[PDB]
């Protein structure tokens, strides 16, 4: 009864089933804060019904706890009225599960929503590893004031901006606001097929600009030259004239003045960078208020840019079967070699292999190479890939050029892991084979299984790792010690 | 035959968890009952000094050795059926 | 063509595709293999149960005075139908009767007569034409197991240290493994039963291998030389291949007994392995031995080495010697007598008693060890013996190869015949001891084989194989896909299989041999993958239990396209093996130069002439689920496995309706399903309404003659019957008054099913589009007009039961007169306490409710005081009435009420004048029936002479030579024992005079039935478990529209959360006005790999401004020129690229954007069924702490990770809130919630219970614990 | 995500070309320590310098300042391009030598024989079914005091040198072949780095 998973200790001692809790689905709440969250009506009045009971008992509706029971149960609009001001200033602390880190539990402040799905934050979604395709989160109420002044103080949402592993943000913006700040701030150049109005036009400030783009006189990816305050080389703020996007200047009108003047495209590295800097030189809540604009803005010219997924988009190139033909014959002369006596087996294998590989690669190029070019870099898929919202170069590669090759499907016992030497010629617009299908089945089932059973070991792991660190605590301020480690430049391969 | 009509409650994977509850409102429902029998009882002592000496003493004695006809009756003179329709 | 079907456009190019194998053959031709209602007497000679009585009979006693055999076994019709056995909550069994005859062998009683007799063995669970078996109202699978197939099993194993250590293990149909191994010694060695190890060469004498030169002359490696100066001189140097022994006789006088024993005992002269030398040469002279055994001088007996370190490590050189070794080391004991010694041995290894390797484990050790042992050897034999050594030393010497244990050949598949008949074995096994016991203590002749027999000990196995079994499973019926894959599951878990932990990653893997028999995308996506598979479309189970796929063969080059074979996995071997959408020209052959062959696990490209087989369908390496993506082929394999997934977690929809874009293979799933009631035969309709459907069936003449039942036939539609899931089942009639029907037609639609296909989901309006944010990571955003039209709007049934008892306290009674409730909540409630129909259950109100007697203690003297003033307010009753919880908001659509008639005196004469009325109506029915058989038989025969008619008795009922009239006829006095003999000269009349008589017997018998089963019901009652007088139920209906929250998901892998519900007029429009219904995130598309989606899409849209639905296989669907046709036909942008207007402003969008018809599902996965909230609630009586479970009212559990998280933040105060008053304060969290009612400050924690109870269980362990300050 | 990672590729096999050759990445001086050289033939047949020595380790540092730029370590049997004290310029090849098998380099010149060196005990001959060609590869044997063991000796039959052979690697030379120095005896094949794990 003491020992193991289910034992008293680590089911009953060091973890309990608790009160004043909740779960429920979550959705997307895009229009909250980084320190709100929507709370189904029932949920809340469940919750914080003895809070409920003290304010009907106050106003004299009642004078017993079981008649403030029935009003309540009875969903009385004297319920959501005392609701209203009693969620104010009573945050709930969000958790899903697994708890990797400290970030699993937020607290966030509620409020009363229609439905019976809890409204979370997306720029909290990274902290959770939380998607919206049907996970479920716990909602714990604190009670005491020293808790809820623990939850507003340490666990509030927009304070945990940076990951305590690293020290770079954590809450930053990603897919939709990463592409629509990266469509934003992406320049647009003139040509005569297609011309951008209000190109080359000088603006006294960003005033003008929003004077401009609002009467529809200069688009959004135009390239003009607005005088704003910069640094210059000794470090003070003047005023100068740079060349930049009208995408930019509508960025750059909430980005705080301390931070200088932002001209770079927008993707998920630099809008890291961007936040960490901005978190330098201000404080925690004019970051907080920027990146909740930042959401707001990537959202909506997303939204108003219609970005999609066409099979227009997927351009394989017309060059696939020209190369594939000559890998054919590369192959075919090798394997005429291998017949009559120069090459060995093995050397035939390593010289298949290196043939389709380079031809492969070519392949991959001249797809980065089309999709980049196409539409003037305005290719949906290509700003989803640039920008860092979502894919990479291996996906756009089995997109459009071919699946190259895989592994076989060799034991253990066997030495290695060979690979076949007929790569998979075809891709995911043209459609694989049966024979393509069933090799990929088996690399995808590999790899779902090391998922599904190789984070035992990871949590065996931290809980190890927890339990031998428990005890370290900052328990003075200085511990007199003439002592230390030299640290160096890390380089790897010079 | 029943020891082995009985199972356990090992059989129930985390059996702890979902098993074997309670709630406390039973408990206060039962004590307030309680106090409502007390009361009620208390009333009813309080009537008692109100009645004639001879029916207080039959009720008194009624609750301390209990309806019990025959050795009220030897212990007072009436008999069996007068002790009774006096209680 | 059939009335009221899609005629659907299909873009297929593959011809001459065979047609599928019945969906549920592994299910139901596995059934009735084992069983059946119907056979005739001559049929039932392989029919598996005969088998299975054959094995436990003769039973004969220890006295050998009687013996007890078996004639025949007979099966009676259920005693309730399908339906009715859902309904009561009762299992769908078959009664079973056996006839048996007890007779004696001992002439010295000849006082007891042999009696033949029939017996009720008792109820078998019996599958439903469906494929499932009924159990306590509920239907369950006999899942397929995956195991390790009988025969022999050569493997490898790496040691500690680095050296290979072999086996080769010997897989019985039933029993223990024999495991030989070498050891790190290079010595070999058997295992028994995993007892401890034993010598290989003493097991080679113990079985009858006396000497060192049988030893030697197994693998033939020593030479025999006479024993002489010259020779030994002539061979010296040469290694000696056996020990040289000295043998004398010892005489041993035992002092308890005083016999004298003869020990022989053996002196090692020369050890083997010894140099021959001239000094050697006068030991050997001396020792008076004849012949002397040598090396041969072949190299390759040093390949054999080993088997002369075994004899170095064999500490026995006789014959006795080793026998008497292995006594010792197995029984722990000396050897009583050389007998038994012997015995013990030929027992263990030689005896079908402790193991059986049946016909496929003979069969396959005759192949793997090429050898012809006669297939009546059931038990292993020596030469099995010698040459499972010698491929073991063949495999030492690296020249042989290791057994692959994921080969499809070495997985063998027990289906659902195989475990009912090994389970009825051991029912009957146990019946037999039984049997066996009671006739050795009886000994009056007053016994008989009824006496004799149990039925509790077979029915007892049975239930247990039915109720608790890993394999007897829930069924997945959530849709009737659900269904039909659980049904063709093939699980690697269970009894005799492997376990989660134990489960590596080659076992989950992909085999080569997969192809075609498992598929390799319908896998559980956690940690279940891999262990359970599912059966591919076009694989079959042979009779031996190993998975075949089929080819069509090809002879030089030419494919044969009129024949196709069924190949199993090891009949596939060393053939290369083509696709199935090859060119061929006009007279067959393959008109490609180089064709990619499937050569065991590789991909050679090789001419046509080296081609061997070719696969014959597309979707051949599918299943159904996987067999019904379109587009599959344009979609990842991860998003493939996790559609078929989900298409079978949806929900059935009040208005189904059917794909614009589907494979065609929808109308078959809803054929093979048997959910839908499917015609058996042509004929047109009578009578058609919502309840029934009835139609005259075309009966042939003959046919009319033989059977006793109208050609009318009624069928009653399923209306809204809950599932195990919770999900409906609600069937309409499609079928209008007069329509002619075929065989197999659908007449009824529903159950997710739309016109006889399989209809999951609805056909939306999507435009792939970033939309304010409410679509980010794989949310969705739909429009209001889904739950505006009923779209996604489905029924889910809860099915609620109260048991009313016999306690000690008295009998609990169902009454609406509930203590300390107002009338208001007993308002809806009729005299027994029930809710009635069509009333809205709310949260809390109450559904059954109840009275259990209250505990009345001694009736002490004031309590019987002031109940006799104040009165009996106080009755003694407690409420036990069943309450909605606070989620349940439902119409009550059905109630029921079963309960036991109570016997009384009066009742029982009541039941006495009731069953003889039931009687003689009963035989009034009875002798109708026989006036019709006896009119048909006499028109049938008329006019002829009789060849002989013989009974079960063997009496000749009607002589013969006499010509037919009506007077002895009916003068025969039974003709359901009517066996044997020919009625006339005629073959045809016999044939009909023998099909009369089954259909005869079939009616007797389910009229029988009916009188036994209103025997039944007049005397016991309701059929109701032991110790409870009524069951209540009720079913409540619960109509869940979509809303947020709500799972969806389409076919490719891609699913969502309804984040929000957008107005009409939000949502982005067209030019023509009309806005999208859905709105997905584009970004799922690339790095998800899912194209196939967007290729739906296009097509589908195309569809709806055609009015056409396209059939689109997978693998060999519609390709890109195909869509943009008919993209062009319908006025639709090509790809589906369209500029979109946003509905909240009116611009125009940037960019255009993916727009079409996508089919989309609802999951099962229910915001109404997630959300839980709890202030307070039930706590447990032993941690004191929360309980767990929305149903409980249960708390969410703050575990170890969460503290950590905690503990990181630095809350100590949250984390002793969490700690102590929240779950086990008891003190604390009562006065922390009168403190928040209060407004007072909080109170301060104190010790939580559960390390109370820490503490108790270590005092309880005698560990003195002591809290010190 | 150390085991996530492997979901998104899909079982592909990756492009991980192991770094056949070393090469300077700054401007300077490379000095070698514990360096030996013998002079062998390469494939083109011309004279070639090959380390013998595993604990070589060249320093290339800046001829301004002094301090170390930068520090490697050469591989065993590696071909060496620089000689020590050579003055170097960045993207020059220090050395190269073969990625996917390791090489045995014979330091004196002699006579090769074989030491407890049997075919079916302690080497199998691998051959091709089409080409015929034949590979010997030195397997486990039963008996761990069979050593095999290449002698190299002189013309008097003295055994100047002898080489302890691991399991798996291949014999390229034969019983009883002259050979010379800087000769590749045997080639262990090294594992050959697949797909990242
Ligand atoms: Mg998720």
Not at chain 2, 34 to 47: L, M, N, P, V, Y
Not at chain 4, 135 to 155: A, C, F, H, Q, Y
């Amino acid at each position: 009864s003491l020992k193991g998973k289910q034992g008293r200790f680590r089911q009953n001692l060091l973890g309990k089933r608790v009160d004043y809790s909740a779960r429920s689905v979550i959705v997307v709440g895009p229009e909250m804060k980084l320190y709100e969250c929507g709370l189904p009506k029932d949920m809340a009045a469940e919750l914080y019904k003895p809070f409920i009971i003290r304010k009907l008992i106050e106003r004299g509706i009642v004078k017993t706890v079981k008649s403030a029971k029935k009003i309540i149960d009875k969903k009385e609009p004297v319920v959501w009225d005392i609701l209203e001001n009693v969620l104010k200033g009573h945050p709930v602390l969000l958790n899903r599960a697994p708890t990797l880190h400290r970030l699993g539990i937020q607290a966030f402040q509620p409020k009363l929503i229609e439905g019976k799905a809890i409204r979370l934050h997306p720029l909290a979604c990274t902290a959770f590893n939380a998607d919206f395709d049907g996970d479920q989160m716990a909602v714990h109420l604190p009670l005491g004031p020293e808790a809820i002044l623990e939850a507003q103080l340490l666990m509030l949402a927009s304070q945990n901006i940076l990951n305590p592993a690293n020290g770079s943000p954590i809450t930053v913006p990603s897919q939709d606001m990463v592409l629509g700040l990266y469509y934003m701030t992406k320049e647009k150049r003139s040509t005569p097929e297609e011309p951008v109005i209000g190109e080359g036009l000088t603006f006294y400030s960003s005033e003008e600009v929003e004077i401009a783009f609002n009467e529809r006189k200069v688009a959004l990816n135009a390239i003009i030259k607005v005088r704003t305050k910069d640094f210059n080389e000794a470090g003070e703020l003047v005023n100068k004239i740079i060349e930049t996007t009208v995408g930019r200047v509508l960025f750059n009108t909430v980005v705080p003045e301390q931070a200088g003047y932002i001209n770079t495209v927008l993707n998920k590295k630099s809008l890291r960078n961007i936040i960490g800097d901005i978190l330098a030189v201000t404080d925690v809540p004019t970051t907080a208020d920027f990146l909740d604009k930042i959401k707001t803005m990537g959202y909506e010219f997303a939204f108003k840019g219609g970005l999609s997924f066409s099979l227009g988009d997927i351009i394989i190139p017309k060059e696939k079967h020209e190369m594939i033909a000559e890998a054919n014959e590369q192959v075919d002369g090798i394997m005429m070699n291998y017949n009559m006596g120069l090459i060995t087996f093995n050397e035939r294998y390593n010289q298949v292999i290196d043939v389709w590989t380079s031809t492969n690669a070519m392949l991959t190029e001249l797809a980065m190479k089309r999709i980049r070019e196409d539409k003037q870099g305005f290719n949906s898929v290509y700003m989803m890939l640039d920008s860092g919202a979502r894919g990479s170069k291996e996906q756009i590669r089995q997109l459009t050029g071919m699946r190259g090759l895989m592994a076989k499907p060799k034991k253990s016992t066997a030495g290695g892991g060979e690979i076949i030497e007929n790569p998979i010629l075809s891709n995911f617009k043209e459609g694989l084979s049966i024979l393509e299908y069933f090799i990929s089945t088996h690399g995808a089932r590999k790899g779902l299984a090391d998922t599904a059973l190789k984070t035992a070991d990871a949590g065996y792991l931290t809980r190890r790792l927890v339990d031998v660190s428990q005890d370290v605590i900052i328990n003075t301020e200085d511990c007199g010690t003439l002592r230390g480690i030299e640290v160096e430049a890390l380089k790897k391969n010079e | 035959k029943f020891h082995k009509k009985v199972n356990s409650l090992e059989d129930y994977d985390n059996y702890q968890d979902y098993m074997v509850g309670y709630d406390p409102v039973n408990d206060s429902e039962n004590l307030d009952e309680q106090e409502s029998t007390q009361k009620s009882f208390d009333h009813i002592k309080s009537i008692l000094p109100l009645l004639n000496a001879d029916k207080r003493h039959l009720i008194e004695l009624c609750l301390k050795y209990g309806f019990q006809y025959k050795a009220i009756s030897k212990v007072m003179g009436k008999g069996i059926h007068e002790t009774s329709r006096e209680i | 063509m059939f009335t009221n079907t899609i005629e659907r456009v299909n873009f297929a190019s593959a011809k001459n595709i065979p047609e599928y194998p019945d969906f549920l053959d592994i299910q139901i031709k596995s059934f009735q293999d084992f069983f059946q209602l119907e056979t005739k007497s001559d049929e039932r000679g392989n029919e598996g149960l005969y088998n299975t009585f054959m094995e436990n009979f003769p039973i004969t006693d220890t006295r050998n005075q009687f013996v007890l055999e078996f004639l025949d076994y007979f099966i009676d019709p259920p005693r309730y139908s399908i339906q009715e056995c859902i309904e009561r909550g009762l299992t769908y069994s078959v009664p079973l009767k056996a006839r048996l005859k007890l007779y004696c062998t001992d002439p010295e009683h000849e006082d007891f007569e042999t009696i033949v007799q029939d017996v009720y063995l008792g109820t078998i669970p019996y599958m439903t034409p469906s494929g499932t078996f009924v159990i306590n109202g509920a239907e369950r699978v006999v899942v397929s197991q995956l195991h390790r197939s009988p025969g022999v099993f050569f493997g490898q194993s790496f040691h500690a240290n680095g050296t290979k250590l072999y086996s080769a293990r010997v897989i019985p149909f039933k029993g223990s493994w024999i495991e030989f191994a070498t050891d790190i010694n290079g010595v070999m060695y058997a295992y028994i039963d995993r007892k401890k190890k034993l010598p290989v060469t003493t097991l080679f004498r113990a079985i009858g291998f006396e000497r060192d030169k049988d030893i030697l002359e197994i693998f033939d490696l020593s030479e025999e030389v006479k024993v002489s100066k010259a020779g030994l001189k002539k061979v010296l140097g040469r290694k000696l291949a056996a020990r040289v022994l000295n043998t004398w006789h010892e005489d041993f006088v035992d002092e308890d007994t005083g016999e004298v024993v003869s020990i022989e005992r053996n002196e090692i002269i020369l050890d083997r392995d010894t140099i021959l030398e001239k000094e050697h040469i006068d030991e050997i002279i001396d020792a008076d031995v004849k012949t002397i055994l040598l090396h041969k001088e072949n190299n390759a007996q040093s390949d054999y080495a080993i088997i002369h370190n075994t004899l170095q490590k064999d500490p026995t050189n006789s014959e006795k010697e080793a026998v008497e070794h292995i006594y010792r080391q197995l029984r722990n004991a000396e050897p009583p007598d050389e007998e038994t010694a012997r015995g013990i041995i030929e027992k263990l290894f030689f005896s079908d008693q402790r193991y059986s390797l049946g016909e496929v484990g003979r069969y396959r050790m005759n192949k793997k060890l090429g050898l012809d042992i006669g297939m009546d050897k059931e038990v292993l034999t020596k030469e099995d013996i010698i040459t499972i050594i010698k491929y073991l030393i063949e495999l030492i010497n690296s020249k042989a190869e290791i057994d692959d244990i994921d080969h499809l050949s070495n997985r063998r598949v027990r289906t659902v015949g195989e475990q009912l008949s090994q389970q009825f074995g051991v029912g009957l096994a146990r019946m037999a001891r039984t049997i066996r016991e009671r006739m050795n203590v009886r000994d009056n002749e007053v016994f008989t084989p009824i006496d004799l027999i149990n039925a509790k000990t077979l029915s007892s196995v049975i239930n247990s194989f039915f109720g608790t079994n890993q394999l007897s499973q829930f069924m997945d019926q959530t849709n009737p896909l659900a269904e039909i894959t659980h049904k063709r599951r093939l699980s690697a878990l269970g009894p005799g299989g492997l376990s989660r932990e134990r489960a590596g990653f080659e076992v989950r893997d992909v085999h080569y041999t997969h192809y075609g028999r498992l598929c390799p995308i319908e896998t559980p996506e956690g940690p279940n993958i891999g262990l359970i598979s599912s059966l591919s479309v076009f694989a079959k189970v042979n009779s031996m239990g190993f998975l075949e796929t089929p080819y069509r063969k090809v002879v030089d080059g030419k494919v044969d396209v009129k024949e196709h074979i069924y190949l199993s996995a090891e009949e596939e071997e060393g053939m290369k093996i083509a696709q199935a959408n090859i060119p061929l020209k006009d007279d067959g052959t393959i008109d490609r130069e180089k064709v990619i062959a499937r050569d065991e696990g590789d991909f050679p490209v090789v001419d046509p002439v080296e081609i061997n087989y070719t696969d014959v369908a597309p979707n051949q390496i599918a299943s159904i689920s996987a067999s019904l993506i379109p587009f599959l082929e344009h979609d990842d394999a991860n998003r493939a496995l996790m559609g078929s997934n989900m298409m079978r977690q949806a929900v059935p929809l009040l208005r189904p309706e059917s794909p614009i874009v589907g494979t065609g293979l929808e109308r078959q799933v809803a054929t093979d399903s048997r959910v839908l009631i499917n015609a058996e035969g042509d004929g047109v309709v009578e009578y058609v309404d919502a309840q029934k459907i009835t139609i005259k069936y075309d009966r042939t003449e003959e046919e009319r003659l033989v059977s006793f039942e109208e050609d009318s036939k009624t069928y009653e539609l399923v209306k809204f019957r809950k599932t195990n899931q919770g999900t409906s089942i609600n069937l309409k009639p499609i079928v209008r008054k007069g329509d002619k029907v075929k065989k197999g037609q659908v007449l009824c639609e529903g159950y997710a099913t739309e016109k006889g296909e399989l209809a999951l989901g609805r056909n939306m309006k999507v435009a792939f589009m970033p939309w304010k944010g409410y679509n980010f990571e794989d949310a969705i955003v739909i429009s209001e007009k889904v739950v505006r039209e009923d779209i996604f709007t489905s029924v889910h049934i809860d099915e609620y039961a109260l048991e009313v008892r016999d306690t000690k306290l008295g009998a609990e009674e169902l009454t609406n007169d509930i203590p300390n409730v107002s009338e208001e909540a007993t308002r809806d409630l009729d005299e027994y306490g029930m809710i009635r129909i069509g009333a809205e259950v709310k949260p809390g109100d109450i559904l059954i409710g109840k009275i259990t007697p209250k505990g009345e203690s001694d009736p002490t003297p004031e309590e019987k005081l002031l109940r006799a003033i104040f009165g009996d307010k106080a009755g003694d009753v407690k409420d036990a009435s069943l309450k909605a919880s606070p989620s349940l908001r439902g119409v009550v659509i059905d109630k029921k009420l079963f309960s036991r008639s109570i016997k009384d005196k009066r009742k029982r004469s009541e039941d006495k004048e009731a069953i003889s009325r039931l009687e003689m109506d009963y035989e009034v029915k009875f002798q109708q029936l026989k006036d019709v058989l006896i009119e048909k038989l006499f028109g049938l025969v008329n006019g002829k002479t009789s060849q002989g008619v013989i009974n079960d008795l063997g009496e000749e009922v009607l002589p013969k030579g006499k010509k037919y009239t009506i007077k002895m006829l009916n003068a025969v006095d039974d003709f359901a024992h009517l066996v044997g003999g020919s009625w006339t000269t005629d073959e045809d009349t016999n044939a009909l005079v023998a099909d009369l008589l089954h259909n005869y017997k079939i009616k007797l018998n389910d009229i029988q039935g009916n009188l036994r089963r209103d025997k039944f019901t007049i005397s016991v009652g309701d059929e109701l478990p032991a110790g409870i007088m009524k069951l209540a139920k009720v079913y409540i209906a619960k109509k869940r529209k979509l809303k947020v929250g709500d799972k969806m998901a389409g076919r490719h892998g891609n699913k969502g959360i309804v984040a929000r519900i957008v107005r009409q007029e939000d949502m982005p429009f067209l030019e023509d006005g009309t806005p999208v219904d859905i709105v997905l995130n584009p970004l799922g598309v690339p790095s998800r790999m899912n194209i196939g989606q967007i290729y739906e899409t296009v097509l589908g849209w195309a569809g709806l401004k055609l009015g056409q639905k396209y059939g689109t296989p997978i693998f060999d669907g519609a390709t890109l020129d195909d869509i943009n046709e008919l993209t062009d036909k319908a006025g639709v942008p090509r790809f589906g690229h369209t500029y979109l207007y946003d509905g909240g402003t009116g611009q125009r969008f940037d960019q255009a954007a993916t727009v079409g018809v996508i089919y989309m599902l609802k999951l099962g996965h229910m915001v109404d069924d997630k959300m839980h909230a709890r202030s307070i609630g039930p706590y447990s009586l032993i941690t004191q702490q929360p309980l767990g479970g929305k149903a409980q009212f249960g708390g969410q559990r703050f575990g170890e990770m969460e503290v950590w998280a905690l503990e990181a933040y630095g809350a100590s105060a949250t984390l002793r809130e969490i700690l102590t008053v929240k779950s086990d304060d008891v003190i604390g969290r009562a006065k922390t919630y009168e403190s928040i009612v209060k407004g007072e400050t909080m109170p301060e924690p104190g010790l939580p219970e559960s390390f109370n109870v820490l503490m108790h269980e270590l005092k309880g362990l005698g560990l003195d614990i002591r809290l010190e300050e | 995500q150390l085991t996530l990672r492997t979901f998104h590729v899909g079982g592909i096999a990756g492009n991980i070309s192991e770094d056949s050759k070393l090469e300077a990445k700054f401007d300077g001086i490379a000095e070698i320590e514990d360096l030996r050289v013998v002079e062998g033939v390469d494939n083109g047949g011309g004279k070639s310098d090959i380390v013998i020595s595993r604990t070589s380790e060249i320093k290339i540092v800046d001829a301004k300042t002094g301090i170390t730029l930068s520090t490697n370590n050469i591989p065993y049997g590696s071909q060496l391009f620089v000689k020590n004290g050579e003055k170097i310029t960045k993207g020059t090849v220090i050395c190269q030598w073969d990625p996917y098998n390791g090489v045995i380099v014979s330091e004196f010149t002699g006579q090769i024989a074989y030491e407890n060196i049997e075919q079916g005990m302690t080497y199998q001959v691998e051959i091709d079914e089409q080409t015929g060609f034949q590979e010997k590869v030195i397997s486990e044997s039963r008996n761990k005091r069979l050593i095999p063991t290449l002698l190299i000796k002189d013309g008097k039959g003295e055994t100047i040198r002898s080489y302890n052979l691991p399991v798996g690697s291949h014999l390229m030379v034969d019983n009883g072949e002259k050979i010379k120095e800087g000769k590749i005896l045997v080639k262990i094949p090294r594992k050959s780095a697949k797909a990242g794990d």
